[PDB]
């Protein structure tokens, strides 16, 4: 059904994201709750995989939207909540990538300082602050989304649009990506080939996942509706969102389950 290549590829990527991320995040957070101790290294991974779990669990709304390919299947409250609920998980995950990169940099840049200050409660407090900052980053969409005509059945959507799009750009993707590439450059320059491999893969996956979302974000302001550019852009935008989501299924494998220790603990625990 709905055989358009852009939408069907988007639904493929989304279904793959769900199918990989339910187990991917579920098993790692289950291990973190039972087999893995609540260390500082565990705290960032727990919060990250939890944000990714929220990303995955809320994705069936995106699948439903893709299948309906228009209008809105629920009420006004549903349309006001759903985007915020999904994208809070997304942006919290991105900020937690930033926080992990900063902490990795810190534990290589000033170990004496870490020995005096780095503890579980402090890190968890930072993660709570990041949840709050992400929540702040996502109430604009809550206030601004509304239902309208836009179609044979009432579609839902919304200066503010450019304002929040650019604000979310600068604070949720540019600052994260700049900080991350700086940290992963510095760590490699301190540490070597294995360090370089992990750092480059970690930056690459993040950029591949989140660049499409934002380039289409700004092009949505560049291109007017009811034009080829608008139509083709919004068509492929589903795939862009799908990539940004797939970040959430990749993250467990490229942070926590890299470690032979954590992955061995998983392989032992997940039996029965």
């Amino acid at each position: 059904p709905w055989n358009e290549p852009p939408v069907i590829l988007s639904m493929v990527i989304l279904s793959l994201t769900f199918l990989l991320g339910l187990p991917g995040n579920g098993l790692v957070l289950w291990v973190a709750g039972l087999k893995m101790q609540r260390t500082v290294n565990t705290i960032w991974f727990l919060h990250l995989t939890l944000a990714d779990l929220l990303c995955c669990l809320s994705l069936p709304f995106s699948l439903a939207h893709l299948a309906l390919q228009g209008q809105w299947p629920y009420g006004r409250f549903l349309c006001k909540l759903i985007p915020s609920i999904i994208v809070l998980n997304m942006f919290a995950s991105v900020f937690l990538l930033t926080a992990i990169s900063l902490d990795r940099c810190l534990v290589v840049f000033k170990p004496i300082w870490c020995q005096n200050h780095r503890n579980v409660g402090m890190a968890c407090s930072i993660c709570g602050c990041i949840w709050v900052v992400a929540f702040v980053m996502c109430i604009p969409v809550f206030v601004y989304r509304e239902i309208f005509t836009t179609d044979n059945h009432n579609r839902c959507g919304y200066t503010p649009l450019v304002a929040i799009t650019i604000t979310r750009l600068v604070v949720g993707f540019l600052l994260p990506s700049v900080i991350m590439i700086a940290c992963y450059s510095f760590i490699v320059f301190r540490m070597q080939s294995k360090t370089f491999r992990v750092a480059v893969v970690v930056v690459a996956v993040f950029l591949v996942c989140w660049t499409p979302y934002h380039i289409f974000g700004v092009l949505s302001l560049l291109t007017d509706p009811e034009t080829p550019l608008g139509k083709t852009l919004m068509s492929w935008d589903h795939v862009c969102i799908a990539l940004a989501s797939a970040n959430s299924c990749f993250n467990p494998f490229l942070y926590a389950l890299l470690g032979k220790d954590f992955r061995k603990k998983a392989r032992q625990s997940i039996q029965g």
């Binding site: 997304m90 969409v141 509304e146 005509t149 919304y158 949505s220 969102i241």
Partner: peptide, 9 residues
């Protein structure tokens, strides 16, 4: 005015 938009934006 108004424009419809997917969830992730």
């Amino acid at each position: 005015s108004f424009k419809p938009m997917p969830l992730x934006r």
